[PDB]
Design a protein around this ligand. Structure first.
Ligand SMILES: [Mg+2]
Ligand SMILES: [Mg+2]
Ligand code: NA
Ligand code: NA
Ligand code: NA
Ligand code: NA
Ligand code: NA
Ligand code: NA
Lengths: 173, 173, 173, 173, 173, 173
């Protein structure tokens, strides 16, 4: 039953990787929803839409890299349903950025727990995989989203549609 | 409540588009599963894996184009859960190709029903959208998959692992 | 007696590095033997030979990088005899690939023990050296060898000399 | 009070980063002093001066990267006075190189303690930041300085002004 | 005791140069603090940050040129502690620009006193050094900062976060 | 049992080739030891290290060419243990060069005996292989090492660390 390549790869780590794959696919779907919200004719913030579509594709890439990891270690991928995002209508550029920040922090928390598990199972390859490919990416993403939220708020979002317009132009464009 | 851009776009068409979006996202996820099945160390068919990953990304592109359509017409996207694929283990190159063929034919059937609905609602824009972007693509995909299945079977798949090996090299590589 | 550069470098880590150097040199020599086995006129698999010669040189590079590490930390290299490989005749492409897989897993196990020792001695530089330069390399090498073994077996190696011939051409060539 | 981006970043780590920033700025200032010592008309070792000025600028870069880290994690930078270096007159090329070696080892010790703290607080992002950007840099710097000191001593520094002259020309030039 | 190169270089001028070196290093450190204030996630004015970092590096260059002068004339550099800046939190883009203006005017006043001293000691080389490299630079810097402050105030800084946002984009970007 | 390609290739020649392969691998390992001796922080002669590493790789190439010969003639390679070098610490640039000279002369003596054996067995292919690829190489290597030893001695090695320093720079650099 054991893969010929498997070495020092605990069942708990394999299961946690499968959960992280699902979470990354979920994040990609959340960002897809946000993108096309901003593509609505009654929202019409093209650069918000582009920003979130880029994030969606990046999240898909993260999921695929985890799947590649799983196969590299000799674990077996078990996919689950990708739940629909919590919202259909993201209300505003600022609200979407705040939800993105919350999402990225949740993903980061899951990654930190994954690292803790790897450490407990003395899986240095897994630990360094997470460190190299995920944790700094997450820190950067959180910092960027926080900067965006700060700017929107200082500009007067979401009540100032001019605020969101100019942010779309000058920051995201 | 009605979008300022909406014109000659029936509620039934909007709902059918939302269903097609979900179906395309589902197909993308199926192909993703197949790709990483072939990436397993105990399967190890790199070009099968590449082929199905390409298909996965293409299906995502199809879904996004439908979302763009929905917004263009002034309908509203409502996302649903993306169900996990029917299999974790796709058994063989031939079996995966046959399942892909079945999937593509199901997608085609859904597209044909969408066209029929558009026609019944006298929505020529929608009809020609489907015709231009989807129906021929589907016909081509089905023909290609049928050709692949035919070749694998004639070569002796799935019992001839040499068969699948050489198909991976010479057709998909 | 203590090197002017030495800092946070335990005697046990220094000794373990010397053992790893010997192991890497041993692996290089094993791969050299395999390469020239496939260079025999009665075996005559040029691409197997090339593959294993490449691996031999890579293993030498790994050993030299460990020697460089040893000097960087202010430890002292102590070389030992390089034992001859366990076989003169590697029997088949498949058998050689399986022995290579076993060898790479043994090297990986030694690296994991080295990492555990470094961690126990709170030597983060050493830990990250191992993580960055060795562990992922090992995981990749094991995955690649497992893929090769899987393909050869599915093709019908080692009884199908046609199998090995075509693998030599299409995978290793 | 808590930054919107802050996650898994302990107050003790934040304080330790602020201390490391100060230490890096101090090291930059030490190297600046050494550089301009060698720029004196009665010392006149241009390549020593260039070497230490380069080191000064590199140390400033290290400090700024730590400040960037601090902001990325949502900690707050608190700057302190930069103490003047211990010497105005560095006596000789050899003496300056030895003091540089001592300084680099002190910086390394502080980094190791920072890593230990990060580990104790289960801050893998911080650990890997230190590992990736600082620890190997330090090991290299210490090895290089030790090599320089060894060469100067073997050449006959500091009594052989010819020794320092030729080292300036051939190693540092 | 007297340097072989020293000619027409009064002890008072040497001491005043040492004081100016310290002041330039202090200004560099002030600008560094301001830069990383604007790098905070809750401030998030990237172009303010870049502007002040550039100023910090320029101030370092000014200090190093004074050190070079000191050695050229045969004076001896005596470094002092670099005091921490007066603020940790610079409150706003406008407030930081006003503090920068005040700082630059203080530096200018010190330079003017240095010139007066040089003149009194009949040190035309020193006078022209100051004139050529420092005084016009200061005048320009003060004029630029005054222009910035004027614009921010007219735009509605610091209460209009939109004001600072657009200034960051259009003037400093 | 006899290889299909074997012609005019005596068992004694085959055995002597296997011994020469081992000797070449041994020489490679000796040079590797010397290289990393000079890489020590307390020796720190980078160009000595580079010179000996180059020699190590060249010796490995010689061994591989002999293995290729063995297979070309239809003999069978039998590898033996590679003994560790006689020294861990090579004491000085001059001492290492003298040991290298002794080693190269021993290798040359073995080659001359190999040629004599080939001649006695009327194996002109083997004789000319040795002549073309090995004997002149050896003569050159011995002459070069003798020149190096002569220069070091005249310069005052090994007591003059300046001597070795300048030789490292000007001859080996
Ligand atoms: Mg074929
Ligand atoms: Mg790491
Ligand atoms: Na992600
Ligand atoms: Na499709
Ligand atoms: Na290795
Ligand atoms: Na540093
Ligand atoms: Na200045
Ligand atoms: Na040789």
């Amino acid at each position: 039953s054991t893969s010929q390549v498997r070495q020092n790869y605990h069942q708990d780590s394999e299961a946690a990787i499968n959960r992280q794959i699902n979470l990354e696919l979920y994040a990609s779907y959340v960002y897809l929803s946000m993108s096309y919200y901003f593509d609505r004719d009654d929202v019409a913030l093209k650069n918000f839409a582009k920003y979130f579509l880029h994030q969606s594709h990046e999240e898909r890439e993260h999921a695929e890299k985890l799947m590649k990891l799983q196969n590299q270690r000799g674990g077996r991928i078990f996919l689950q349903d990708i739940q629909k995002p919590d919202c259909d209508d993201w209300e505003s550029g600022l609200n979407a950025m705040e939800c993105a920040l919350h999402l990225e922090k949740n993903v980061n928390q899951s990654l930190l727990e994954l690292h803790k598990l790897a450490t407990d199972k003395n899986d240095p390859h897994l630990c360094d995989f997470i460190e190299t490919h995920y944790l700094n990416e997450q820190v950067k993403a959180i910092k960027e989203l926080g900067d965006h939220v700060t700017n929107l708020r200082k500009m007067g979002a979401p009540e100032s549609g001019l605020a969101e317009y100019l942010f779309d132009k000058h920051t995201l464009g």
